[PDB]
Ligand SMILES: CN(C)CCCN1c2ccccc2Sc2ccc(Cl)cc21
């Protein structure tokens with residue numbers, strides 16, 4: 001369903017600070033409410049020395065903006081990670097230059113699909129957004145969002 | 159702010175049945191909740207004989223999906239209509255071929271801006287969506303939505 005992975009991914013090199021500039025999802029209800037399931041705001045990507053990928057992120061739960069840490073285990077494919085939860089959830093890195101931008105998707109085999117355009121600073125990278133839009137033409141997305149520099153510096157983008 | 163109007167608009171010819179295929183807005187909160195302010199689902203456009211434009215639409219209010227009728231008065235500019243309410247609200251027709259598609263925007267001078275891609279049938283017109291996307295490149299939109307043929311036939315797109 002996501003036929004776009006980064007060739008030659010060096011995962012150690014995605015470590016550190018990231019900003020969820022834009023999001024997009026297969027279904028409107030995955031992103032429309034602040035508490036919508038795919039509305040996760042990346043804080044930080046932390047590769048483990050064994051090539052697993054730890055994602056630190058914020059999520060609006062009930063009232064507060066909550067901190068969450070989730071581990072995405074490595075696979076044979078360098079650009080694909082698994083969170084064995086209620087379903088097979090895969091994290092796929094589509095593309096990155098390591099230092100400005102990183103596109104990735106999360107897909108639950110059930111059909112549910114959300115992708116993000118991550119950037120290193122709180123700025124609108126119009127180039128990174130072009131690349132994001134190009135990889136989404138291929139996908140059955142029905143909601144897209146984008147954040148301004150002010151919202152990027154707030155918790156949960158409020 | 160919207161520098162894209164249809165040249166040579168014949169307003170009588172937009173009359174009758176329409177479907178809100180896609181929406182997009184300047185701010186996420188204009189479209190994110192089902193009760194979000196710019197989340198209006200067009201039923202029908204009815205030109206009056208004096209060249210005023212009556213919009214019949216559905217809006218999710220409190221619980222139910224409500225019917226609403228609003229009149230947009232004519233101006234010197236054939237493609238621009240006004241709803242004199244709490245602010246100057248203008249309805250602008252950007253483009254149409256009358257028989258498949260119509261792009262229009264609603265703007266409140268305050269900054270608040272929502273645009274829609276209307277189509278005549280419940281079908282995904284990939285061409286009409288391309289034209290919609292081309293007119294939005296020019297605008298400071300931060301949320302976009304799109305509906306499937308099943309949702310187009312439900313009240314309020316549920
Ligand atoms: C509770 N939330 C931290 C995890 C669920 C949200 N989500 C997600 C987000 C960040 C990292 C991995 C995932 S797995 C996934 C697969 C499909 C969809 Cl649609 C969303 C997600």
Ligand SMILES: CN(C)CCCN1c2ccccc2Sc2ccc(Cl)cc21
Nearest residue numbers: 195196198226247264265266270271272
């Ligand atoms: C109560 N709702 C029927 C009218 C308000 C929603 N809305 C709108 C929708 C359909 C026809 C005209 C308008 S004026 C307008 C201007 C700016 C924005 Cl952002 C939204 C709107």
